[PDB]
Design a protein around this ligand. Structure first.
Ligand SMILES: O[C@@H]1[C@@H](O)[C@H](O[C@@H]2CO[C@@H](O[C@@H]3CO[C@@H](O[C@@H]4CO[C@@H](O)[C@H](O)[C@H]4O)[C@H](O)[C@H]3O)[C@H](O)[C@H]2O)OC[C@H]1O
Ligand SMILES: O[C@@H]1[C@@H](O)[C@H](O[C@@H]2CO[C@@H](O[C@@H]3CO[C@@H](O[C@@H]4CO[C@@H](O)[C@H](O)[C@H]4O)[C@H](O)[C@H]3O)[C@H](O)[C@H]2O)OC[C@H]1O
Ligand SMILES: O[C@@H]1[C@@H](O)[C@H](O[C@@H]2CO[C@@H](O[C@@H]3CO[C@@H](O)[C@H](O)[C@H]3O)[C@H](O)[C@H]2O)OC[C@H]1O
Lengths: 739, 772, 390
């Protein structure tokens, strides 16, 4: 048999052999894609007639054979098998396709579990739980013959105007990077032939658009770019061996990311050693022409993207077919096509597709992971405020009010395929329900009814927030940016009208972004933040309200007092986070309403006995930080212990405090444990005036606490010795354990 | 005589001779400063006792001998002469001091005219008028023996939260640069021995702090930095030969500007050829330690600042005395001190101070420039909205309402002497441990014409109700205002800021406004007055854009009056009654709301919108009023666009002509604006960006031709490799009455090979008028 | 009077005023040159007929009015006075010429002392003696109305194959730099109105050609370049305030020095703060075309050299006349011409030429400096070996 067909040969040999056999047209075909829906008839069955046109010379990827066809799992699996058989048996070289789906919150297609949104995942501060989640997602995807998931989002969000905030892991490069590595590891596993390719997106800076506006310029200078925005992707590449990256739609400082070789090649491939495929953001090649206006035609767009280092044009071939013409006309070298094709073929071999591209349809029934979803929902909800009203007693009469109290659709996030009162009923609570108002618009005609049921109750539970998705009726999600951060519609007014009854008020926010709570916070008795929880949402909320679950989520993003305060974030430099010299704005504190890492409990945790050893370490040494934490209250609960590091008198300015470690710790009432952080000096490296990564001698401040503001214990150690340039591989994360 | 004393020798010879004679201590002394107030006794007279300690080895500068002493001009001149005589006659080498003052809106001291704020200056779009202004300021300053004015501000402002917005020339690097060059040219003149050193500030990026917060990081990437923030300073250095620069307090991306040699030396001196002195922002050296936490002590702060390229520590020696110790301990080379001292001595020779450091006290009486101030105020006020109510008829009974109708203090900006000095009053009042001044302030304040006075002089029948204060939540004055409105024909509601440095101020340095709502309950006052159903003219006397989304549709006309200083009242009333036809144009976009920030006219194709619904969920992405906006009591008709030639090579020139006719019934000035757009460059470019303008006077029914000469140098931008280029392709020409009100469009092409623009290149379009 | 004519005005004011009055043609003329021998008749006297063609719009420099004419000193002084009177009185703006001569081993013309070669100068290890020498050369040159001497050579020589070894101060960047500073200081003095502009050459690397062959590539890596070859020029610029630099004919690693903005502008002007004029090596602009083959015609050669930072084309205008055409055709900006013209006019003001461009012919008799020459010769000879015979 030909070498490329022989599984006893090393992949490099098979790749070289195959490439040597391919025509230019066949090469270019491997750099494009076709939609699943383009390959089916009106009953969702594979159409050989359509495949003969679209797959004649092979194809790089099939886009969303499940997500774009609305097929149930077994039918999607059958479609994918039929596509693969056509490629294997009815093309000249028989190269199989790679299949991709969205999977951020689970496989985005019929029959898959709708897990809580990414910002909820982050709020758990539980990396192992997220790895468990994506290990499940991996098996769901493989059942239908899907090889690649377009997740996770490693965009670092400090601008909650942006509609895609919900898809991020929040403001902290450390927490984003750590959750990202766990996410990737679960999807891919050790041998990708048994796993699913992860796709970190949107490389890079995409969460920092001008004015929080989708696709607008992300004008970030170099040190900030490296330390905040690139860092999570760097960790995914080097620690998690991520096998795909997708680019940002935005320009950075005049250069669209899809046309930026310095970004997609020089940083990603040359500096960091990425060996997988870069897939375009959907239509990102064409919009080099249409939107950014730097390419005069589809040929030029193709050339810019290929030179930049985009290997596969998604979601359908549009500009990359003109790569054939560009070679034939002597405008680009076929060697550059070969480089891209090599990357794509290698990954196809690594996935095992040339040995077996088929799945067993009888096994393609996707299993529910409602259990994992509920664990995330229960650990993600954040208790922002509680004057003692919560937990409630079951014998209290509840007035359940608001648009998000009754509305299952509004529990869903923007990449859940299908984009509470029931939970109260199941728990056996006596309540009356009033919608109060819609999520959007100005209609106040439901206020009187809500007020009247409040007046007759013991406690009003007001459930407000977003509708997430991509259409105009949505208040958050991709393309739905909110300038002024007010709760949508007249929901704020509803809360305040209910509060005016004098009844106790529990405010439940079911939202995708931070909202300004400045006008309600001091008028309500407790506040729960419930990031869009998907199919597990209702149960977790009621579990928390009644104390069956002790809330344990912590904010992964700061809650601004107002939009005019943006940005607020915990790791400001000494000059950040204040106005000099009066501290505050004329009209507003410079402090966020709720800080990063904030989250209360129905119990109290007491921290003691900080140990830092040794007190002096050299610039590639390690310190071990220990604290004791005791649950001194009356309820079992989890605490997320947080490690912040500060530095002064470096050669550049540094954060006053910045997250460098954390551990979720379970404590029974009156239980005490020791939490241990092992901190390698590599983890503290920062860029100096010359853009070198260094550790400089001096003092580092250690701050351990329950939030970025609720610091319990402080101390310090010193780095002693000559400045160190940190070269080559280095540690990214602290290790945490319990003793 | 020693060579340095001999005026027949070239300055370089005199400098080298002097430097060769100086001790290390004497050298370090030239890099520092003393406050004016440290050199006077209780009667405001020079104190030899204090001078013996502070000036014994000479000094670089005296900080604000007028501005910090509350001396009248002849007394300040006497002080300065006595300081110079002490230096000339009672120090070993007899080196005279340079004196600096604030002068942004005029010499900031007693007796100086209070001109309108810088943002008002920009709103005139009249560079020559600003040059006339600073030529007058030059003469005022020289009368008191001042050599350097700490102006202008070339910070480009796109974030109106920032309290220093009023000190800027707005959002456009083009307009800021062009106004800055005129400003500098007027202060300095041709021969600096007869002029005043200008000080461009705050180098660079200082108007782009995180969240609009004073001193917070200004994290700007390189092409934006060069094209937006550096550009006005580049023009000031290369076209206007500016002789001083002051640094930004902020860090850029981890590096404090006061410690950044890449900025204060490599860009400013090496790349651009700046030959003057860099003066520290006040206390900027020390706060490398105290604020940024990158210097461990005062010695290290001094070293970082000197290495970066700061020549003089202001406002008083604090860290730079330790440069002596650093040399003596072999930590720094004396050669690096010599480089700084050389710059300072050269400028002192160039100012003529070694030939004559004295002024004639009998001539030190500063003249009023109310005339120039009034021309600026009259050309600066912007008509943002007018449904036809303006101009008003003089027979209409007016209800004059609001805090800014009745308080002269609130006409003043943050670097006008009687506003700025309030901070000192606070600090004196805060002394709880171990007079004539508060009286001289009040009496000088009383001299300033009021808005009330202006209405009275114009002969209008009106009643006045304060309505509310600038700050706080007290609505107990609303009822009175509402009642006088109900009894009137028209309510003129005058609201806005109190500008300054203290907590009771709403704008100015250190007073940043997050949410851009009119201060206090002033918005509510406007809306309550409107609810009477009477016609409402809203007059904003402010230092920044405010959100007007909640009032714009509820009022009949809106006038923006950037803090106008002493000419304010007359100009406002002149405009309201049509004695002056408003002609100001916005130099900065007015956001709909704070959450929309930033909004600016020169967005890239992906800027200024949210894709793919265009708007935010809750808000338009368009500003409420765009850059260049400003209405008139007449109408201007644009015709006959000519663009020649249609194809030009990469260092060629195109000539753009338009005819503009005043087709209305009142004489008026129009500011004709030229915008250029470009696509299919190798980098993204603004869809439209200002590249030229001309204020043109037109009588009723008069037509003139406006001509723009546009060299391709002016269009240069930075490519992917950070080279300044002109690339072949098509440029769109858009000429109109604002950045949105484009009247005529066309295009020309650049033909030939891509050009790297090297060395000196043109910065500005030339604009003139011809007979139509 | 016009500001540029007024000696009470600062030079910067005079420069800006003059530049503002000049046509493009007059500007370009200040960036070129004419040979002395092109301006004389068969009897060695100034020719008004020849001047009317060659000087009609003014000129940057006259090349070697003594060195190229075989005139005795008083006759060369007369020639130079007649050239200057023509420029001052019979051109529109009356800008005087700068005159240059060779002077490495003394004024290179009849009547000047022949001092020992530069390598002999270095062999004295006596910087003050060399400063005494060039102080004398200064007075010789000023007597004939010469303003600039094309010396010293600061090329550091480690390859004795090269025929220009004798013109260098040898192999040591330290000794070359120290001798160079003294050389420059003697020629220029404190106030250049009373001195002669020195011209450090050949910037830079020119003594390190492939195989020791004249004009061949000088392929020197960056640290060596900075520490060995640039260092003496750096010292001349920063310590000695040298007012002219002349470029190397060679390429460095693919880039001819006459076309290298990174060298003649970014290092020399931006990094080091040089404020004088860069004068081309003779014919160096044209040979960007003829020899290096990187310019397709004289226009392109002119553009490359001007962009690189050459202010004056020597020894005669050849390519730089096309700078007029390049501006008129919109290929280069007139601002770039203005930058060069500014440098040239500033130096002409600093030399006092607008106050007095003439010399007294009765004083133009150059004195012998055999005494100084003998001290150098006596201190320069090296005893390499002596078994006792001497
Ligand atoms: O109320 C009291 C507070 O004021 C005081 O805090 C200090 C207030 O003054 C602050 O220093 C300021 C810093 O900014 C300087 O402005 C520059 C001056 O020169 C201008 O040309 C330039 O444009 C400006 O940027 C200003 O001169 C100086 O006074 C100081 O940092 C504060 O700490 O604390 C005590 C309270 O009672
Ligand atoms: O025998 C005849 C050959 O000479 C002739 O070839 C030309 C000879 O002259 C060459 O031009 C030289 C190039 O070097 C110049 O020297 C510089 C002058 O200024 C000094 O300050 C600087 O130090 C020197 O480097 C010299 O002036 C000039 O004459 C030319 O390139 C040759 O092609 O061909 C005809 C034969 O018959
Ligand atoms: O994370 C990836 C997303 O960034 C990506 O989203 C695409 C965004 O563009 C959408 O196209 C718009 C649809 O509406 C029209 O009116 C607009 O003109 C279009 O630009 C497209 O539908 C999205 O797929 O999708 C892939 C994700 O992994």
């Amino acid at each position: 048999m030909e070498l490329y067909r022989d599984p006893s040969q090393p992949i490099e040999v098979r790749v070289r052999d195959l490439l040597s056999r391919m025509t230019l047209e066949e090469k270019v075909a491997q750099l494009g894609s076709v939609w699943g829906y383009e390959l089916i008839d009106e009953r969702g069955k594979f159409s050989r007639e359509k495949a003969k046109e679209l797959l004649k010379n092979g194809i790089g990827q099939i886009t969303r054979p499940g997500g774009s066809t609305n097929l149930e799992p077994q039918e999607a699996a059958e479609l994918v098998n039929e596509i693969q058989r056509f490629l294997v048996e009815e093309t000249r070289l028989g190269i199989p396709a790679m299949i991709h789906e969205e999977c951020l919150t689970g496989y985005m297609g019929l029959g898959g579990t709708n897990f809580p949104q990414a910002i909820a995942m982050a709020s758990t501060w539980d990396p192992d739980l997220i790895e468990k989640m994506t290990t499940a997602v991996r098996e769901d995807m493989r059942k239908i013959g899907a090889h690649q998931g377009l997740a996770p989002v490693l965009d670092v969000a400090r601008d909650p105007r942006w509609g895609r905030t919900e898809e991020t892991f929040g403001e902290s490069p450390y927490l984003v990077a750590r959750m990202g590595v766990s996410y990737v590891k679960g999807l891919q596993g050790e041998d990708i032939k048994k796993g699913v390719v992860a796709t970190v997106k949107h490389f890079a800076g995409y969460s920092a658009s001008e004015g929080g506006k989708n696709w607008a310029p992300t004008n970030i200078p170099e040190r900030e770019f490296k330390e905040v925005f690139l860092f999570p992707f760097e960790a995914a590449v080097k620690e998690a061996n991520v096998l795909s990256v997708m680019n940002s739609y935005s320009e950075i400082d005049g250069v669209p990311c899809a046309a930026n070789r310095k970004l997609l090649t020089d940083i990603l491939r040359k500096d960091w050693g990425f060996e997988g495929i870069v897939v375009s953001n959907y239509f990102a090649v064409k919009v080099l022409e249409d939107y950014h206006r730097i390419a005069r035609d589809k040929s030029e767009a193709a050339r810019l993207a290929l030179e930049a280092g985009i290997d596969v044009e998604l979601p359908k071939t549009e500009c990359y077919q003109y790569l054939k013409d560009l070679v034939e006309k002597g405008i680009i070298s076929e060697a550059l096509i070969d480089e891209a094709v090599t990357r794509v073929l290698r990954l196809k071999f690594m996935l095992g597709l040339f040995e077996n591209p088929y799945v067993e349809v009888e096994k393609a029934k996707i299993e529910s992971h409602r259990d994992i979803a509920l664990e995330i929902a229960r650990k993600s909800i954040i208790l922002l405020k509680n004057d003692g009203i919560l937990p409630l007693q079951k014998n209290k009469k509840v007035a359940l009010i608001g648009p998000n109290a009754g509305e299952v659709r509004n529990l869903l996030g923007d990449y859940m395929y299908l984009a509470v009162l029931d939970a109260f009923k199941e728990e056996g609570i006596e309540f009356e329900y009033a919608k109060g108002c819609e999520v959007t618009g100005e209609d106040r005609s439901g206020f009187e009814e809500a007020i009247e049921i409040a007046k007759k109750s013991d406690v009003a539970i007001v459930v407000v927030g977003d509708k997430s998705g991509l259409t105009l009726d949505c208040t958050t999600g991709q393309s739905r940016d909110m300038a002024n951060l007010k709760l949508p519609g007249v929901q704020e007014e509803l809360v305040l009208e209910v509060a005016k009854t004098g009844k106790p008020v529990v405010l439940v926010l079911i939202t995708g972004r931070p909202y300004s709570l400045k006008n309600v916070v001091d008028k309500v008795n407790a506040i729960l933040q419930v990031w869009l929880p998907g199919e597990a949402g209702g149960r977790a909320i009621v579990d928390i309200i009644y104390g069956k679950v002790n809330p344990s989520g912590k904010l992964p993003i700061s809650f601004p007092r107002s939009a005019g305060q943006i940005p607020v974030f915990h790791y400001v430099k000494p000059s950040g986070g204040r106005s000099h010299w009066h501290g505050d704005y004329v009209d507003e504190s410079t402090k966020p309403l709720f800080p990063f890492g904030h989250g209360l409990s129905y119990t109290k945790f007491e921290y003691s006995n900080l140990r830092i050893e040794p007190k002096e370490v050299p610039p590639a040494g390690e310190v071990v930080i220990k604290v004791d934490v005791e649950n001194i209250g009356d309820r079992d609960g989890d605490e997320v212990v947080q490690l912040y590091i500060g530095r002064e008198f470096a050669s550049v300015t540094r954060p006053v405090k910045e997250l460098k470690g954390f551990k979720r710790v379970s404590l029974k009432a009156k239980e005490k444990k020791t939490v241990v952080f092992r901190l390698h000096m590599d983890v503290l490296a920062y860029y100096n005036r010359d853009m070198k990564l260094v550790v400089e001698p001096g003092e580092f401040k250690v701050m351990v606490g329950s939030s970025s503001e609720d610091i319990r214990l402080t101390g310090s150690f010193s780095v002693v010795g000559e400045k160190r340039e940190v070269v080559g591989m280095r540690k990214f994360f602290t290790e945490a354990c319990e003793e």
